[PDB]
Amino acid sequence: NEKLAKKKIVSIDAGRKYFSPEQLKEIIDKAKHYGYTDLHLLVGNDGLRFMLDDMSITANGKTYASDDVKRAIEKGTNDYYNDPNGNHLTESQMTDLINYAKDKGIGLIPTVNSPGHMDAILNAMKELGIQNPNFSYFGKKSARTVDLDNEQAVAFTKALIDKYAAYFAKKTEIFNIGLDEYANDATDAKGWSVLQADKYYPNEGYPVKGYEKFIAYANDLARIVKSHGLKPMAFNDGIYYNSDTSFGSFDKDIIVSMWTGGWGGYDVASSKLLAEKGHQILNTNDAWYYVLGRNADGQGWYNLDQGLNGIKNTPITSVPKTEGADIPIIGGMVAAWADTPSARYSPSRLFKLMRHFANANAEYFAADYESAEQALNEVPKDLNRYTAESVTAVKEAEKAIRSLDSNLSRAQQDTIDQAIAKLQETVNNLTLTP
Ligand SMILES: [Mg+2]
Ligand SMILES: [Mg+2]
């Protein structure tokens, strides 16, 4: 019961790279088939590839017109990557996609990333006329990250998030605000250290109250998301970075997507600390990451063979940086990324990754009843013309399938499959009364 009740999630980076409604429906079909519960769809992640029908934004003592915001976001996303396959999903397409997923028992969790990984939103703000939205580090400007000292940029960004969250209200349950990898380009992946630095190394030109403002920012987004009845989620790396609780406290209602245990000189809070602070944790271990186009050993970090190895060697219960503690989880999430969005999207490669994650953790993933349902639909409805003995065998086989536990895992798939085979055999053995 506890294993099957977990969320099993596939994450798709449709922020950097365009994915069509058809492509996403196919992913949903596979997710359902392999026993997943949710699709985690990034739509704002460097690029921004989801447009509401009304994109008007009220901030900074004015309203930015819907059509101007749309044109700014379309231009801004293209400036990040002009994808020949498409620019954005429309509101009609999103609503249809969520409905399609819901009818299959699949939830959809969107991401609209900030204050990092927001190249397109920063570009859009510049197109609207907002001045100097980008964070800079000793003259090196981040293409991805907003300056938290810029009230006009921050106000616009929050109102944009609010607008998206208002749309997702009722139709989803979780909204990922991201919060990962602050100014990773401009600081050479040391952004959290940079934001915290002025407190400990004053008068050296580090951002004054940098990390303190980030906490306030994260918390305000959490408040905004919660106002819409949605649970806010965020990636772990900036949450109590360096295990430092002295700058302030994060909203406990933020679910933590735990993707990294950190690296040399990038010292993240342990999952133990985060649990102890009151956060629920979604295991998003980057052991399972796949970057499109990096399709085999040697082709770079998060290549497909690496991800498949991570899936074989790091179970769904193994959370980054536990300090040896027992870390409870709300579920697990395997993630595919489009760091190089011009890479060709290969469905079979993604589905292999998804299939392996489900098979490696089979007790956690729901069994497939699709074919059992179909087999029942294919039984002849009227059996009167057949012998009593052959009829009895069919009715017994039918009962046996309807008697199956409706909460079996992938680990018990063969139980379902044998029941299907037995029904098919009994139907084949139906004998006309002589
Ligand atoms: Mg590219
Ligand atoms: Mg492609």
Curated annotation (Swiss-Prot):
Residues 1-434 are annotated as: Catalytic domain 1. It is found in: Secreted, Cell wall. Belongs to the glycosyl hydrolase 20 family. The chain holds residues 181 to 614 of 1312 of the full protein. This is Beta-N-acetylhexosaminidase.
